[PDB]
Design a protein around this nucleic acid. Structure first.
Lengths: 60, 43, 85, 97, 72
RNA sequence: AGAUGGUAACAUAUAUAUAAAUGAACUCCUUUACAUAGGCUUUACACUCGGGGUGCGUUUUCUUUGCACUUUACCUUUAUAACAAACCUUGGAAUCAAUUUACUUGGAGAAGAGGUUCGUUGAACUCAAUUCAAAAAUUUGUUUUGUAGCAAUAGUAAUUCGUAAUUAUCCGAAGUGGUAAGGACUAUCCUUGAAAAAAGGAGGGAACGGCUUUGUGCUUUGCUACUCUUAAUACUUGUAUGAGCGUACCAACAACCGCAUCAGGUCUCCAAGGUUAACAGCCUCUGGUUAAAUAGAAAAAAGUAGGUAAGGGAAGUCGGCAAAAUAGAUCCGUAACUUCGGGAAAAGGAUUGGCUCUGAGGACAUUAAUGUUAACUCAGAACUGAAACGGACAAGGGGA
RNA sequence: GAGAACUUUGAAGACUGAAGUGGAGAAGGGUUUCUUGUCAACUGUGAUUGAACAAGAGUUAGCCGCUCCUAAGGGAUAGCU
RNA sequence: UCUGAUGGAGGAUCGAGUUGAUACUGACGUGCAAAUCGUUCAUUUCAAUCACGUUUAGGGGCGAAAGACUAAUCGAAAAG
């Protein structure tokens, strides 16, 4: 259902497909989006984010 | 491959064009079909 | 210090091939890898480049010689007879 | 060099205490790994809405944000406040969203 | 892209029939430094100006046939 | 009818653009254009460390903290700077000297001093323009600016504002040696490691101004502003730029070949962190995945893939098959025999963690003397522990 | 969604571990690509999934390649058999 | 003649990868597979390995030689 939007969000945010987060609710709005333009706009209004990269500390 | 000759590409297009079904309006008055994975063109 | 008692440059061959074969190849690799006297410049700097070609590192001039030494006794005597006349 | 940490907007809503912040910075900012050796090389003064930190040694402005987060986590308002830089030498407590 | 340093050559290139546009760029450094870039057929020629005054007389003194492009 | 500087190596055309430095036949070269091994070295990229800024995270306790971003293409003969080399001038070498990790080099001209060029690289160096003082009818020092132009206008990470715009940052110093390339070298071969298209350099010196005119392309008469090169324009030239073809996707993990959506096969490039000798093994970041012709429950026999076993230790078996036994590194010790090279990791001993220290190994400046600063590498000592320490991973059984 | 162990989303526990089911290509394939539908059969269980089926779409070069050169070599000319 | 360094030779050694295939005569043997899977083992500067191109064609080729290989076909291929 949301695989197209996952792929487009990965492209737009220049990160891995495994690093973009869709709002678990309001997925109907996400499904409405079908272009990089729409993906960009609902990333801007926060329905998709980019998860932080897993911490790899060099302290030890 | 991505690299092709003009004749080879035209032949591939012809095979794709012939792989289509019988028009519905005709059928109301096909056997020679192929799938890219089952039977190879060999040409 | 002294690294080999007698094997010399043939130490590269280890124990392989006979001792007589190694000794015979030593006696001529010694003179194949030697530096000879360049009569054109007087500096002992002519080394073998290929099997019959000897080049001086200074003059850059090259001469035809033996397979393993700059001159061969047969050709040395041959030239001497001609020069005698 | 002088640093400003404003709290006007939150302490107007009376969620922090400037004297508490002042005391935290006085007894918690460390110099030479020592926590109360400010003496004459680092000084910190107060204001009815600001906090003034005047340093005379190589000092990182990020330290102020570090202590401010530490304080507002100790007193459990961390989920409400953020420390956002405004100028070169100023931090300010902002609400979320 | 080429950089021209003296004013005489830059003005001469501006007066050529080939040149089409002048790009004016202004930006803060620490004082606004600027640079004027003539767009000729072959190359884009640039001159930088620390001097506000020189920069502010030169673009005016340039003749207005060729089109202005202000990037800031 | 063909320029000029330097003693020389060689250099010079910066016009929007270093375009033009005459040159035929005929020639002679160069580039294209080439192996392997070894180390040394430079640069870029990679990785890493510390500082500054920004954001996030942890926050019972500790933590001036952990993480992320902090960027810069081609092109400008890019200009310069630096350096391995080669060459030139001067110089004139034994008490031989210069010099490399290595050896390499010199009266066929070394060291020293001063230069030229190529090649590496590509803003280095005050590089460029600019401020301020000594040189004279244009040089040397001191400053400002600019990421050198490209260039910030782009990119990234942030803070906001109708919902498309404003804002601020994008800069200070290093270490390791992973990859690639280049350099100057040394060594090896009974092995010497393509060609041509194409491009360039040279030797040579055929031909020769312009207007007009004698006579027959040749002597001739009066006069001098005169040839090549790049760009644009106008007209003639058939229409006076840039043809045609490929370009999706897979490349195996289900897109290929194995009769298949088959645990098989199938060429190339990139290549992070920790431990480490290591692109090994094991764990991790980015990226990817959580899928496999099925699932759930139970869990006996038997099978299969393994573990562990008292005492004995090959009695088993055709046969130690299979398994077990150490196995890294450091220090010590090492026989017969031998083609003198080996045998050899022979055999066989000891040590090994953590912590707190001690010693040794460099670079950079001042008027024999005192400060600033960097690698992990070795050696030794105390302490400490359920005597354990190549703690997992990885990893010879030896001998006659 | 009629229907969800094997469709999608979020959360968790893990794996691959730069010698990778990570990125780019060649050979080979030839539309499998994309979007929208969609389930008779196939997708060895299910299946709403799909590389299946259906309708449309998608491949833009003076500078990346071919095209040119020559190599191992092939074909042909002159002859001669 | 001896000792210490330096140096970096060799169809030198160990060993991943590659290239193979010693043993378990393991699994499987109605296989994942008309030769695979696991562990073990050989091999890594050279008579090394790989790709594409190219040449040699059936009483012929090619063979570091097993009558091996020549498209699951070889003491004479395959097709008619």
């Amino acid at each position: 259902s949301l695989t197209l939007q996952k792929r487009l969000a990965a492209s737009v945010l220049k990160c891995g497909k495994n690093k973009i987060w869709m709002d678990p609710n309001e997925i109907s709005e996400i499904s409405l989006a079908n272009s990089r333009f729409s993906i960009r706009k609902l990333y801007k209004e926060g329905l998709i984010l980019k998860k932080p990269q897993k911490v790899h500390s060099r302290a030890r | 491959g991505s690299i092709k000759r003009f004749r080879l590409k035209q032949r591939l297009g012809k095979c794709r064009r012939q792989n289509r079904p019988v028009p519905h309006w005709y059928r109301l008055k096909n056997t020679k079909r192929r799938h890219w994975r089952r039977t190879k063109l060999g040409l | 210090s002294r690294r080999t008692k007698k094997v010399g440059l043939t130490g590269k061959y280890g124990t392989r091939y006979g001792s007589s074969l190694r000794k015979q190849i030593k006696k001529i690799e010694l003179m194949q890898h030697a530096k000879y006297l360049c009569t054109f410049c007087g500096k002992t700097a002519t080394k073998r480049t290929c099997v019959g070609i000897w080049k001086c590192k200074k003059c850059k001039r090259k001469v035809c010689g033996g397979a393993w030494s700059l001159t061969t006794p047969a050709a040395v005597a041959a030239k001497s007879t001609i020069i005698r006349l | 060099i002088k640093y400003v940490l404003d709290c006007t907007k939150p302490v107007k809503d009376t969620i922090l205490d400037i004297s508490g912040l002042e005391q935290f910075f006085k007894d918690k900012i460390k110099v030479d790994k020592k926590t109360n050796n400010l003496k004459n090389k680092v000084v910190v003064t107060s204001d009815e809405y600001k906090i003034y930190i005047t340093v005379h040694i190589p000092f990182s402005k990020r330290y102020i944000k570090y202590l401010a987060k530490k304080y507002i986590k100790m007193h459990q308002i961390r989920d409400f406040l953020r420390v956002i830089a405004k100028g070169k030498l100023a931090y300010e407590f902002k609400y979320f969203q | 892209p080429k950089q021209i340093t003296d004013i005489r050559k830059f003005l001469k290139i501006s007066r050529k029939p080939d040149t089409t546009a002048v790009i004016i760029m202004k930006k803060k450094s620490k004082t606004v430094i600027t640079k004027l870039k003539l767009r000729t057929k072959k190359y884009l020629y640039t001159m930088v100006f620390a001097d506000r005054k020189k920069a502010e007389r030169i673009e005016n003194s340039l003749l207005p046939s060729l089109k202005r492009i202000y990037y800031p």
